[PDB]
Symmetry: C3
Subunit: 223 residues, 3 copies
C-alpha cells in the first residue's frame, strides 16, 4: 500500500516555478483531521514566502479529493474559541488573515464532500475529473467547525442555483458544477492533475509582479 | 373565489412549511397598500414561527402579479413604510428575512413581481410565464424598482437589455439568465416549489440559517463599492 | 483617411444617439494620452447633451483596440482626465449617468475588454479576438475588469484569462456574459444602433434612475 490511513498530512514538491501540494490521506478518503489541516495551512504559508514559486497546485492523492472533516478526531481538539491555524500558516479556506497573495490552481476528483467545496472555491482555477461528486451534506447535520459555505458559491452560480444545493445538501456532479461556473473544465478521470499543471504553467509564464497586482486588484473587487 | 377588492394574502401552516398566497386574482394581483402590508405581515409571522422551516410564496389565480397598483398607491407616497413586525418582501428595508423562501410564479409577472421573485432562494415558473420591467417605459418605480439582483443573476449586459428597454421575456429566457431555478409545465409550479421547500425543510434549521446568513454578506453591494476599493489598490 | 498620428475620436449626433468613434486606425487604435483625453472629453460631452439618450462607442477601421500605448503613456503617469471629462473605464469619478452601447470588431486587447465591460450593451463581430495582455506585458490591471470580469464570468473563468493573458474568441466571450450578442462581421455597428435605438425610446429620467440604482446597489 501507499494510501495513508494514518494521521493526515500533505506532500510538497517544487517543480520549477510551481509548488505542488498533495492531500495525503487516501486511506481515509482525505477526511481532514487536525494534522492535515495544520499541514495544509503550513504548506500554503511556505508557498507564500517562496520567492521562486509563482503558482501553487493543490491536488489529492488517491481516488477522492475529500470526504469532508474528520469530526471524530477534530472535536476533542477545538478550543471553545474555535480552530486555530499554526503560526506561519495561511488559511486554506481563505477566511482568516493572512490572505494568500499568489495564484492557486486546484484539481479535484471522485468525492468532494462538505469542506471540500469551499476549499475548491478558494482557488483561482479549478479542474475536475468527470464524475466527481459534490455535496454540502453538513446542512443536514449542523453548523460545521470550519469550511462552511460562503458567498463564493452564490457569486459564481448565481443566488438561486447556489441555494438549490447549499440549503438542501443534495449531490451534484462535475458537469453541473461546470454549468454553474464553479469549474473552468471537466476532463477524463486521471487527467485532472495534468490539466491543472497546464494552467499553472501558463500562470507561471506570466510576469510575477503583474499577476500579483492582478490578484490584489481582484481580491479588492470582492471584499 | 376571485377577490377584486382590497388586496390581501392567504396563510397556511403545512407541517414545517409556511404557505403565503397572493389573493387578489380579481385585479391580477396588482399590489395596493393593503396587500403590501399584509404580505409583509405574513413574512414577519413566518420569521417568528418557530416551526416553519421554509416559506412558499405563490399567487392564487392565473397571474402572479401585474405589479403595483399605481392609482391606489401613488397618492400615498412620500416613501413606503411597512408595519411593525412586518418584513419587506422585496428585501430592501430592514429587517431582512433570515429563513428560506421559495417562490412559484405563473402567467404574468410585471415590474414588482420580478424583484419579488429574485429575493427568494428558489424560483419556479410555469412555461409561458411572461416577465417585463415596464417601469422604464413610464417613470421611476415607487417600489419593487429595479435592483442589483437582476445584474447579479443575469450579468450586467443581459440585465440592461431588459431593464433599459422594458422588453418582455418568457420563462425560458428567465432560466437562461439564472433568475429561475426551474421551468415547469403550466399548473405544476406550486407542486414543484413545494417539493423544493420540503427538501430545505429536511435540512438542519440552525445550519440552514447560518448558511443564509453567510450568503447574505454583501449580496446587494453595488459595483461602485467594488470599483472604489480597486482604484485605490492601483 | 486612417489616422496614424496622435489619437482622437469622432463625434456624430444621429437623432438621439451620440456616436463616438475611436479614430487612430493606423495604430490599431492603441490608446495614447491624446485618445484617452479625447474619449474622456467626448463622454463628458454626451453627459451634457440633453438631446442624446444613448451613446454608441465603435471603432474606425478593422480593429477595436490593440490596447494602451504604454510607451507613450509611460511618462504621463508622473493620470489626470480633462475637466468635464468622464472616465471611459468608469473607475474614477465622476461616473457616467447615461446608457452606453459598444460595438467591437477584430482585435480587442487589454483596455478594450475594459471599455466593453463598462457598457450596458456590447455587440461583437464574430472572429473578434480578446485577451488580457497586462500580465504578459508586465503591467498592472486597468482596474475595472479586475472587478467586472469575475462578475460576468464567475471567478475561475475570469482568472483563467486574466492571470494567463490567453486569447479567446467572441463566442467564448458571449458564453462568459461579457457580450450581449455576436453577429456576422460587418453587422456589429448596425446591430448596436438597433439596441441603442431601443434604449432611446424609454423615458430618459427613468433610464437614468435604473442606472443609478444598478451602480450603487444597497
Amino acid at each position: 500500500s501507499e494510501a495513508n490511513s494514518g494521521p493526515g498530512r500533505v506532500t510538497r514538491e517544487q517543480r520549477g516555478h510551481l509548488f505542488l501540494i498533495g492531500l495525503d490521506r487516501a486511506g481515509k478518503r482525505n477526511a481532514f483531521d487536525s494534522a492535515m489541516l495544520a499541514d495544509l495551512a503550513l504548506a500554503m504559508g511556505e508557498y507564500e514566502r517562496s520567492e521562486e514559486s509563482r503558482c501553487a497546485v493543490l491536488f489529492a492523492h488517491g481516488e477522492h479529493f475529500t470526504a469532508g472533516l474528520d469530526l471524530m478526531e477534530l472535536a476533542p481538539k477545538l478550543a471553545a474559541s474555535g480552530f486555530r491555524y499554526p503560526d506561519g500558516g495561511v488559511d486554506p479556506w481563505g477566511v482568516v488573515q493572512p490572505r494568500r497573495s499568489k495564484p492557486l490552481v486546484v484539481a479535484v476528483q471522485g468525492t468532494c464532500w462538505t469542506a471540500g467545496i469551499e476549499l475548491m472555491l478558494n482557488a483561482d482555477i479549478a479542474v475536475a475529473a468527470r464524475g466527481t461528486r459534490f455535496a454540502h451534506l453538513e446542512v443536514l447535520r449542523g453548523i460545521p467547525p470550519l469550511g462552511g459555505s460562503t458567498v463564493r458559491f452564490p457569486r459564481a452560480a448565481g443566488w438561486t442555483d447556489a441555494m438549490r444545493y447549499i440549503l438542501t445538501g443534495d449531490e451534484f456532479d462535475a458537469d453541473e458544477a461546470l454549468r454553474m461556473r464553479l469549474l473552468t473544465e471537466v476532463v477524463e478521470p486521471g487527467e485532472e492533475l495534468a490539466r491543472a499543471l497546464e494552467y499553472a504553467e501558463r500562470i507561471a509564464r506570466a510576469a510575477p509582479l503583474a499577476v500579483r497586482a492582478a490578484l490584489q486588484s481582484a481580491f479588492q473587487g470582492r471584499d
